[PDB]
C-alpha cells in the first residue's frame, strides 16, 4: 500500500491505558498523515490485564500493531523485536512516559530524506535544567558526522534511525544482560558503521519527561556493579572505535564525566565507605584503560584531579573538594526595558561562593594561580594550578526556557565582556557584563507557545567551571508591553527569578500596567467605555478580544452583567474598550475586565 | 517574703518547673493562684490558691511582684539577682533583660548597659513595655496601678508601665543577666484602630511631662500607624488597605500634631506627608520601590588568636543581597532614587539623604541557640563608606573587625555546652538590617582553649555558628588526625593520637572514652575503653588507656570526646 515513513516502537510492561494518554495524544496531533507512520508496541510479558486492554485499544487504529513476548526484564528485547517487525523508513524509540512535538515526524523525515541521513539527531528536551545538548544542538547540520562521533551526543536513544541501516549492520540493543548506558553502545555502533548523521536543532523533537519515580533497584545502586559497567564501557570504546579522534574523544568525555566526576563534590556527599570503594575502582581504571596522554585534553582542574587520582592522594582530593565547594556565577539584572518590538536586558555577574563573597585567583610573579594551601600546591605540577593561559576563555551568554514546553534555547545576538579585576593586594576577581535582547517570536514554534511563561537564564563558563542559572533580581520588577497582538510582562516571579509572561498565562496586563481612572470616557451614544492603560510599552497594532463584568454598586447579591471588551494598542497607547452597546443600565457599576482569562483589581467604577 | 509570683489561672506543673529551679531560697518567695487546685496547693508551703491579677496583687505579701504567663520560663538565677538589684537601689520597677525565641535582638538599645537610676532617661527606660518586669507591691498599691478591667483592651502592658512611670517610678535596668523568657503562643480592622485611638488618647490625657509625651507619640505613630505604609501595603487586599488607611489618615489628622514629623527620619517623613494627603497610590508604589532593601554581612576572614576568635566582615546595602542599593547625587545632595512622578509630589528635602550620611552604624551580635539569649559583641571597629560605583550612582559599603570572648556570655551551667550564632546589625538611611553573619565557602576551624573545645563553622544554612563543648560537632573530626604520626606504647597501655590542625592555647583536660573493634571481623562485641583529650603547649592530642584487656592485631579506634565520635578511620596495629 502506502509507504511508511516512521515506525514508533514503544515497549510496555504492566502499562495501563491511562499511562499512554499523553503519548497517544502527542502522536495523534502529528501533522504527518497517520497512514504514513505506524506504532509498534511490544509488551514485555505483563502479568496483569493491561495487555488485553492494549490489544483492544489497538483494534481501532489500523496503523498500530501490538505484540507481547515472554518477559525478558527490560526494554532491550522489546525494542529489538519491534524493530524487526517495523516497516518504516525511520525508527523512533519512544518510551511510554515521553511525548513528541506536533511537527516532529514531518520535519525529521523531510530532513532525513532530503539529506539521505541514517541518523537524525533531533533536539531533545528534558523537564529539568536550563539546557540539554547545549553544544551539539547549536545549528542544523546535515553533514554532522564530519565533526566525528560527538555529533551523536547526547547519546540518548531518542533519535530517528534508518531501519535498513540498523538491519544491514546488525545494530541492536543488548538483550542478554542488563547494562548501563545501553544507548551509548547503540549510538556508538551506528557511528562506527559509517552512519550519515544530521542534527536537527531548530525544532524540539522529543520530550524526555522526568516522572519523579526512582529506579530504586539494587542493580543501579551497587557500587561494584557500577564500576563493572564503567570498565565494560571503556573496554567497548577501546575495542571497537578505530578512528583515533573518535576514540580519544570518547575516552576523554567519559573519563572526565563519570570517572573524574566522582572526585569533586561527590566526595562531600558520600561516606568514607563508599568513597574508598569507588576511589580505588577509579584509580585502577585510570591506570589500566586511560592512556596518560588523555589527561592533556583536560582543563586545569581536571588535570589536578587526574594527577592526584593516579597518585592515590584521596586526602588531597577531599580537601580540594572542600575548597571548590560552592563556586558559581549568578547574574543580576542591571537594566530591563522594552524597545520597539523587543525586550532588552543588561546583566552583571561575578564568580562567588554561593552568591556570597568573591571567588579569587592569585597573581604570583607573572602567572595567575589557583588559591591553594601550601601543602597541596607543592604536591602538584606547577602548570596545573596556573590559570594564565585560560584568562581569555570566559563565556557569558543568555538563555530562555518555555515553562510549559520545557524547551531551552540560547538567546542569540548578545554582547558580553568579562574582566579580571584586582580587588586587593594580589587577589583578582572575575567580573562579567552582558547586554542582550529578546524577540519572543524566535521561540514560538507551536501554537501553544504563544501563551506561555518564559524563564530567563545565563550561562557563565571559565577556569573549568560552568554556571547555568536563572537570571535574578532583588528589587520588584514589573514592566508591561503590548506588541503586535502579544501581551508581554517581564517580572520578578514568585521564586525571585526573571520571567516573561506572554498571553496572560500568569499575570494580568491591566492590573500590572495600571488604569488612568480619571481618564475613563463613557460614550452614551455608542455604549463604548474607554479605559486607557497607564504604564505600558505599545508597539504596532494590537486587538485582544476579551470581556468585562458589570455589577451594580451597593447591591450585595447583585447579578453580573457580561459584555464584550477589547484590549487595543494603537499609536503607542493602550486602552480597554468595554462595549455596553445596547444594554439598558442606570446608576453606578463595578467594572472588572477579563482579558485573556485574567481579571484586574483596579477597583474601576463607572456611572451610567 | 521577697518575690510574689502572680499567675493568671488557666486550666500547673509546667509553670512550676522553671520556678522550682530558682537559686533563691524557696521560702523567700510565694506563688499566688486565683478541686485539683486545692490538692496541688495543700502540698506546697509557698502556694496560695485582668481582674484576677488585681486581686492577687492586693493579697500578695512580697516586696516585688512578677506577672508570669503560661509557657514563659524564668532563668535559674533571676530571682536572687533582681531582688538584690532593686532593694539596694530602692527600685520600684526592675526592667530586667528579656529573651525571645526568634530574632537577633530584643531591647537592643535599652538592655545595653545596667542603669540603677534609669528613670532619669525619661519614659524610654521602660521599653520594651512588656508586663514581664518586677514591680514593687508597695508602689503599685500606693498609686493604685492595676490592669485595665471591664474590657479586653490591647497593649494592656503599655498602659500598666505608663501608669507606673507617670507616677514617678524608680526604675532600673538589669542587662547583665537574662531574666525573663517570653514564648508568646484583635484582627478585626475596626477593632484594631479603635484600640489604636484608645492608646493615643491615653497618652495625651495621662502623660504630663512633654519629653515623655512627644517620645510616646513619636514611637507609636512611627511603629503602628506609619508601620502599615510600607511592606504591609504589599501583603493585604485592597478592601483591607482602604479601611485601615482611612483610619490611619483620621488618626494622624485628629491626634498627631504636625511637629511629630520633625522627629522622624526622611523615609518616615515621606509616609507621613503622603498619608495626610491621602495619596495611597504613591505609598503603594513607594512600598514596591523600598521592598527588599537590606544589608547582609559576608565573612572576609575568621581565625583564632590567643584566647579569642577574630572576625573580619564586609557588607553592602542591597535588594535581597542581589544587586546594589543606590542613591543618586544631584547638585550637592544625595537623593533617594524615585520616579519624577513621585519626586515632584514630595517636599524636595524629604528624599535628601545628605544630612544622614554620617549616621551609619555597623555592629556585631551573638546569640545562644539553646538559651535564645542575645548579646552585643563589645569592642568592635567598623567603617562605612558611600562609594561612587558608576555615573552619579552611589552605593553604601561597610567593613568591620571584632573578636569573641565566649566567657563573657557564660552565665548558667547550660551555657558551657551550647551552640552560638553570630550576627551583624547595620543601620542607616532609616533602615535596620540585623541578620545572621554568612559565608559562602566551607569554613571549619577548631580551637582548644582552657578546657573548652571551640569550632567555628558555616552551618547547613550558610550562617556562622560557634560550637563550644562538642554540642553539635566532633572536635577530633574537624581538626583531623595524622595517622602517619601516631604514638603507641604497649607497656603503659597508652595510645597517643595527635591532632592535625587546631589552635591550642592553655592547658586542657577533657574526660572522654573510646571504642575498639578488630579490623577484619565485623560482628565482634564492642570494647569500650576510657580516654582523654589533652591540650598543652600549643598542641592537642587524644590519649587512650587500654591496659585491662589483651589485644594484638589491627583494631578500629573510635574516639568519643564529649559524646561526639570521630570518622577519621583510625586503625591501630
Ligand atoms: O547542560 P549541557 O547541555 O551543557 O550538557 C548536558 C548533556 O548534554 C551532557 O551531559 C551530555 O554530554 C550527555 O550526553 P552523553 O552522551 O555524555 O550521556 C549519555 C547519557 O546521558 C544517556 O545514556 C542517558 O540515557 C543516561 O541516563 P541518566 O544517567 O539518567 O542521565
Ligand atoms: O529589634 P529591637 O531589639 O531593636 O526592638 C525590640 C523592641 O525593643 C522593640 O520592638 C520595641 O519597639 C518594643 O517595645 P514596645 O513599643 O513597648 O512594644 C510593646 C509590646 O512589646 C508589647 O506591648 C506586646 O504585648 C505587643 O505585642
Ligand atoms: Mg491495529
Ligand atoms: Mg549576593
Ligand atoms: Mg506565653
Q: Quick check: CB of B104 below 6 Å from ligand 2?
A: no
Are the CB atoms for A531 and A593 separated by under 8 Å?
Answer: yes
Name A405's Cβ contacts closer than 8 Å, sequence gap at least 6: A101, A125, A204, A207, A446, A448, A449, A452
Partner-chain residue, chosen from A323, A332, A603, that has the shortest CB–CB distance to B322: A332
C-alpha R_g of chain A: 29
Are the CB atoms for A8 and A38 separated by under 8 Å?
Answer: yes
Atom of ligand 2 lying closest to residue B130 CA: 22
Q: Quote the CA–CA distance of A349 and A335 in Å, as a whole number.
A: 13
Q: In the Cβ-directed half-sphere of B323, how many Cα atoms lie within 13 Å?
A: 20
Q: Where do breaks (C to N over 2.5 Å) occur in chain A, by preceding residue number?
A: none
What is the torsional sign of CA A214, A218, A223, A224?
negative
**Beta-bridge mates of residue A208:** A126
Q: Which residues line ligand 1 (CB under 6 A)?
A: A 129, 131-134, 153-156, 181, 183-184, 253, 257
Are the CB atoms for B207 and B123 separated by under 8 Å?
Answer: yes
Which whole-number Å values give the CA distances from B544 to A600, B515, B520, B541, in the listed order?
A: 74, 10, 21, 10
The beta strands (E) that lie in A404-473 are given as: 408-410, 415-424, 427-438, 452-462, 465-470
Are the CB atoms for B111 and B133 separated by under 8 Å?
Answer: no
Reported structure resolution in angstroms: 2.3
Q: Quote the CA–CA distance of A502 and A488 in Å, as a whole number.
A: 5
10 Å Cβ neighbour count for B353?
Answer: 22
Q: Quote the CA–CA distance of B24 and B279 in Å, as a whole number.
A: 58
3-state secondary structure of A261: helix
Q: Do domains B3-185 and B295-334+348-468 have the same CATH topology?
A: no
Atom of ligand 2 lying closest to residue B106 CA: 3
10 Å Cβ neighbour count for B330?
Answer: 10
What is the torsional sign of CA A149, A151, A154, A155?
negative
Residue A189, Cα to own-chain centre: how many angstroms?
A: 27
Atom of ligand 2 lying closest to residue B155 CA: 23
Q: Give the ranges where B30-133 is alpha helix by DSSP (H).
A: 36-41, 51-59, 78-88
Which grid coordinates are listed for B378? 563589645
DSSP state of A426: T
Residue B571, Cα to own-chain centre: how many angstroms?
A: 45
Residue A96: is it exposed, middle or buried by C-beta count within 10 angstroms (0-12/13-18/19+)? middle
DSSP state of A170: T
Q: Quote the CA–CA distance of A259 and A261 in Å, as a whole number.
A: 5
DSSP state of B207: -
Among B67, B127, B128, the mutation site with the greatest number of ligand 2 atoms within 8 A of its Cβ is: B128
Q: In the Cβ-directed half-sphere of B331, how many Cα atoms lie within 13 Å?
A: 5
Binding-site residues of A for Mg(2+) sit at: 97-98, 332, 355
3-state secondary structure of B535: strand
Among A155, A256, A257, the mutation site with the greatest number of ligand 1 atoms within 8 A of its Cβ is: A155
**Beta-bridge mates of residue A428:** A361, A422
Name A329's Cβ contacts closer than 8 Å, sequence gap at least 6: A349, A350, A351, A352, A430, A432, A458, A460, A465, A467, A469
Are the CB atoms for B425 and B103 separated by under 8 Å?
Answer: no
Interior CA angle at A229 toward A225 and A233, to 5°? 175
Q: Quote the CA–CA distance of B128 and B100 in Å, as a whole number.
A: 12
Closest CA to B299 of B448, B422, B427, B478: B422
- Hey, what CATH class is A511-607 in? mainly beta
CA of B101 to the centre of ligand 4 (A): 27
10 Å Cβ neighbour count for A353?
Answer: 23
Interior CA angle at B92 toward B86 and B93, to 5°? 80
CA of B181 to the centre of ligand 5 (A): 9
Closest CA to A147 of A157, A137, A156: A137
Are the CB atoms for A477 and A498 separated by under 8 Å?
Answer: yes
Q: How was this structure determined?
A: X-ray
Burial of A295-304, coded b for 16+ CB within 10 Å and e otherwise, reads beebbbbbbb
CATH fold for the domain made of B3-185: Spore Coat Polysaccharide Biosynthesis Protein SpsA; Chain A (3.90.550)
* B333-337 long-range contacts, CB within 8 A, separation 24+: B334/B386, B334/B394, B336/B266, B336/B267, B337/B289
Q: Quote the CA–CA distance of A577 and A529 in Å, as a whole number.
A: 6
10 Å Cβ neighbour count for A439?
Answer: 15
Name B114's Cβ contacts closer than 8 Å, sequence gap at least 6: B172, B173, B174, B175, B176
Which residue owns the Cα nearest ligand 1 atom 12? A154
3-state secondary structure of B291: coil
**Do the bridges between strand A427-438 and strand A361-364 make them parallel or antiparallel, or are there none, so unpaired?**
antiparallel
Q: Quote the CA–CA distance of A198 and A599 in Å, as a whole number.
A: 47
Q: Quick check: CB of B158 below 6 Å from ligand 2?
A: yes
The beta strands (E) that lie in A309-377 are given as: 327-339, 342-353, 361-364, 367-370
Q: Give the ranges where A479-572 is alpha helix by DSSP (H).
A: 509-513
Chain B: give the shortest CA distance to residue A375, in Å: 13
Closest CA to A509 of A482, A528, A541: A482
Q: Quick check: CB of B131 below 6 Å from ligand 2?
A: no
B328 assigned to a ligand binding site: no
Which residue owns the Cα nearest ligand 2 atom 14? B128
Name A15's Cβ contacts closer than 8 Å, sequence gap at least 6: A43, A46, A50, A54, A96
DSSP state of B562: T
Q: Quote the CA–CA distance of A360 and A351 in Å, as a whole number.
A: 8
| Domain B295-334+348-468 in CATH 3.40.50 | no
Chain A: give the shortest CA distance to residue B446, in Å: 16
Name A362's Cβ contacts closer than 8 Å, sequence gap at least 6: A368, A369, A370, A371, A426, A427, A428
Are the CB atoms for A532 and A585 separated by under 8 Å?
Answer: no
Name A377's Cβ contacts closer than 8 Å, sequence gap at least 6: A385
Closest CA to B223 of B155, B171, B176: B155
Q: Quote the CA–CA distance of A73 and A87 in Å, as a whole number.
A: 26
Q: Quote the CA–CA distance of B179 and B73 in Å, as a whole number.
A: 9
> What are phi and psi for residue B295, nearest 5 degrees?
-145, 110
Closest CA to A600 of A501, A483, A509: A509
**In chain B, domain spans:** 3-185, 190-291, 295-334+348-468, 475-572
CA of B300 to the centre of ligand 4 (A): 14
Chain A: give the shortest CA distance to residue B326, in Å: 11
Chain B residues near any Cβ of chain A (below 8 Å): 238, 288-289, 291-292, 298-300, 314, 318-323, 438-442, 444, 462, 567, 569
Which residue owns the Cα nearest ligand 1 atom 13? A154
Q: Quick check: CB of B134 below 6 Å from ligand 2?
A: no
Among B102, B126, B127, B132, the mutation site with the greatest number of ligand 2 atoms within 8 A of its Cβ is: B127
Q: Quick check: CB of B130 below 6 Å from ligand 2?
A: yes
Query: Do the chains contact at A476 and B322, CB–CB below 8 Å?
Result: no
Q: Which residue of A has its CA nearest to B287?
A: A476
DSSP state of A4: P
In terms of phi and psi (left: phi > 0; alpha: psi -120 to 50; beta: otherwise), the region of B372 is: left
What are the chain A neighbours of B567 within 8 Å (beta carbons)?
272
Best residue in B281, B314, B441, B566 for a mutation probing chain A (most A CBs within 10 Å): B441
Q: In the Cβ-directed half-sphere of B561, how many Cα atoms lie within 13 Å?
A: 32
Q: Quote the CA–CA distance of B228 and B268 in Å, as a whole number.
A: 11
Which whole-number Å values give the CA distances from A596 to A450, A488, A502, A600, in the listed order?
A: 12, 12, 10, 11
**Beta-bridge mates of residue B504:** B448
What are the chain B neighbours of A350 within 8 Å (beta carbons)?
none
Residues bordering ligand 3, an ion, CB closer than 5 Å: A 58, 61, 64
Cis peptide before A154 (omega within 30 of 0): yes
Which grid coordinates are listed for A146? 564530519
Q: Which ligand is nearest to the CA of A34?
A: 3
DSSP A99-147: EE-TTHHHHHHHHHHHTT-SEEEE-EEESSSS-SSTTGGGS-BTTGGGG
Name A203's Cβ contacts closer than 8 Å, sequence gap at least 6: A101, A103, A104, A107, A122, A123, A445
Closest CA to B276 of B236, B313, B245: B245
Chain B: give the shortest CA distance to residue A359, in Å: 9
Which grid coordinates are listed for B101? 525565641
In terms of phi and psi (left: phi > 0; alpha: psi -120 to 50; beta: otherwise), the region of B95 is: beta
DSSP state of B538: T
Residue A385: is it exposed, middle or buried by C-beta count within 10 angstroms (0-12/13-18/19+)? buried
Which grid coordinates are listed for A494? 514568585
Residue in this structure with the C-alpha cell 535559674, named with its chain if needed: B76
B72 assigned to a ligand binding site: yes
What are the chain B neighbours of A603 within 8 Å (beta carbons)?
238
Residue A560, Cα to own-chain centre: how many angstroms?
A: 44
What is the torsional sign of CA B30, B33, B34, B39?
negative
Chain B: give the shortest CA distance to residue A273, in Å: 10
Best residue in A270, A272, A316, A357 for a mutation probing chain B (most B CBs within 10 Å): A357
**Dihedral over alpha carbons B269, B273, B278, B282 (to 10 degrees):** -60
Burial of A19-38, coded b for 16+ CB within 10 Å and e otherwise, reads ebeebbebbeebebeeebbb
Q: Which residue of A has its CA nearest to B462?
A: A354
Q: Quote the CA–CA distance of B68 and B76 in Å, as a whole number.
A: 14
Residue A345, Cα to own-chain centre: how many angstroms?
A: 21
Q: Quote the CA–CA distance of A581 and B39 in Å, as a whole number.
A: 81
What are the chain B neighbours of A473 within 8 Å (beta carbons)?
319, 322-323
Query: Do the chains contact at B320 and A348, CB–CB below 8 Å?
Result: no
Best residue in A346, A354, A356, A497 for a mutation probing chain B (most B CBs within 10 Å): A356
CA of A53 to the centre of ligand 3 (A): 13
Partner-chain residue, chosen from A332, A473, A476, that has the shortest CB–CB distance to B288: A476
Q: Quote the CA–CA distance of B98 and B178 in Å, as a whole number.
A: 6
Name B359's Cβ contacts closer than 8 Å, sequence gap at least 6: B427, B428
Cis peptide before A514 (omega within 30 of 0): no
Query: Do the chains contact at B318 and A601, CB–CB below 8 Å?
Result: no
Residues in chain A: 608
- Hey, what CATH class is B475-572 in? mainly beta
3-state secondary structure of B565: strand
Query: Do the chains contact at A357 and B569, CB–CB below 8 Å?
Result: no
CATH classification of A6-208, choosing from 3.90.550.10, 3.40.250.10, 3.30.300.30, 3.30.70.60?
A: 3.90.550.10
A491 sits in which H/E element:
strand A487-492
Chain A: give the shortest CA distance to residue B237, in Å: 9
Closest CA to A554 of A586, A515, A525: A586
Amino acid at each position: 500500500k502506502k509507504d511508511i515513513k516512521i515506525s514508533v516502537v514503544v515497549p510496555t510492561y504492566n502499562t495501563e491505558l491511562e499511562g499512554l494518554k499523553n503519548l497517544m495524544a502527542s502522536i495523534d496531533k502529528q501533522t504527518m498523515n497517520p497512514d504514513e507512520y505506524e506504532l509498534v508496541f511490544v509488551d514485555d510479558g505483563s502479568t496483569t490485564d493491561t495487555y488485553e486492554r492494549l490489544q483492544e485499544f489497538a483494534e481501532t487504529r489500523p496503523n498500530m500493531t501490538v505484540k507481547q513476548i515472554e518477559n525478558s526484564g527490560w526494554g532491550s528485547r522489546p525494542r529489538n523485536i519491534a524493530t524487526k517487525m517495523a516497516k518504516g523508513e525511520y525508527i523512533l524509540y519512544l518510551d511510554h512516559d515521553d511525548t513528541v512535538f506536533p511537527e516532529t515526524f514531518e520535519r525529521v523525515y523531510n530532513f532525513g530524506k532530503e539529506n539521505n541521513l541514517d541518523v537524525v539527531s533531533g533536539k531533545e528536551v528534558r523537564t529539568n535544567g536550563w539546557s540539554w545538548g547545549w553544544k551539539q544542538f547549536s545549528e542544523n547540520n546535515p553533514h554532522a558526522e564530519e565533526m566525528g562521533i560527538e555529533c551523536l551526543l547526547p547519546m540518548t536513544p531518542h533519535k530517528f534511525y534508518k531501519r535498513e541501516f540498523l538491519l544491514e549492520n546488525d545494530i541492536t540493543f543488548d538483550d542478554g544482560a542488563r547494562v548501563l548506558w545501553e544507548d551509548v553502545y547503540f549510538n556508538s555502533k551506528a557511528f562506527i558503521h559509517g552512519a550519515k548523521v544530521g542534527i536537527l536543532a531548530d525544532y524540539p523533537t522529543y520530550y524526555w519527561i522526568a516522572t519523579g519515580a526512582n529506579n530504586s533497584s539494587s542493580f543501579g545502586r551497587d557500587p561494584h556493579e557500577k564500576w563493572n559497567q564503567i570498565n565494560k564501557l571503556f573496554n567497548f570504546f577501546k575495542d571497537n572505535i578505530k578512528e583515533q579522534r573518535d576514540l580519544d574523544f570518547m575516552l576523554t568525555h567519559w573519563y572526565r564525566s563519570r570517572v573524574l566526576g566522582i572526585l569533586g563534590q561527590w566526595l562531600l556527599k558520600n561516606n568514607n565507605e563508599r568513597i574508598d570503594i569507588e576511589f580505588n575502582y577509579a584509580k585502577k581504571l585510570a591506570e589500566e584503560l586511560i592512556p596518560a596522554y588523555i589527561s592533556e585534553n583536560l582543563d586545569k582542574n581536571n588535570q589536578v584531579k587526574d594527577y592526584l587520582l593516579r597518585q592515590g592522594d584521596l586526602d588531597s582530593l577531599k580537601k580540594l573538594a572542600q575548597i571548590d565547594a560552592g563556586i558559581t556565577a549568578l547574574s543580576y539584572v542591571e537594566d530591563a526595558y522594552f524597545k520597539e518590538d523587543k525586550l532588552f536586558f543588561k546583566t552583571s555577574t561575578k564568580m562567588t561562593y554561593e552568591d556570597k563573597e568573591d571567588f579569587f585567583i592569585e597573581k604570583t610573579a607573572d602567572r595567575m594561580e589557583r588559591i591553594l594551601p601550601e601543602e597541596i600546591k607543592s604536591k602538584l605540577p606547577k602548570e596545573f594550578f596556573d590559570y594564565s593561559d585560560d584568562l581569555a576563555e570566559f563565556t557569558y551568554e543568555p538563555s530562555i526556557k518555555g515553562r510549559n514546553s520545557r524547551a531551552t534555547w540560547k538567546i542569540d545576538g548578545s554582547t558580553s565582556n568579562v574582566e579580571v579585576v584586582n580587588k586587593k593586594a594580589n587577589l583578582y576577581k572575575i567580573e562579567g557584563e552582558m547586554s542582550f535582547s529578546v524577540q519572543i517570536n524566535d521561540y514560538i514554534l507551536d501554537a501553544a507557545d504563544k501563551k506561555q511563561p518564559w524563564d530567563i537564564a545565563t550561562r557563565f563558563t571559565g577556569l573549568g567551571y560552568t554556571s547555568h542559572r536563572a537570571l535574578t533580581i532583588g528589587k520588584i520588577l514589573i514592566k508591561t508591553a503590548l506588541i503586535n497582538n502579544k501581551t508581554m510582562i517581564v517580572y520578578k516571579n514568585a521564586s525571585g527569578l526573571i520571567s516573561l509572561d506572554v498571553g496572560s498565562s500568569v499575570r494580568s496586563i491591566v492590573e500590572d500596567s495600571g488604569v488612568k481612572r480619571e481618564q475613563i470616557l463613557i460614550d452614551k451614544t455608542s455604549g463604548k467605555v474607554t479605559i486607557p492603560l497607564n504604564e505600558i510599552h505599545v508597539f504596532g497594532e494590537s486587538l485582544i478580544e476579551g470581556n468585562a463584568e458589570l455589577k451594580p454598586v451597593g447591591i450585595s447579591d447583585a447579578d453580573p452583567i457580561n459584555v464584550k471588551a477589547k484590549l487595543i494598542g494603537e499609536a503607542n497607547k493602550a486602552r480597554v474598550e468595554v462595549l455596553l452597546g445596547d444594554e439598558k443600565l442606570s446608576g453606578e457599576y463595578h467594572l472588572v475586565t477579563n482579558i485573556q482569562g485574567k481579571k484586574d483589581k483596579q477597583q474601576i467604577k463607572i456611572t451610567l
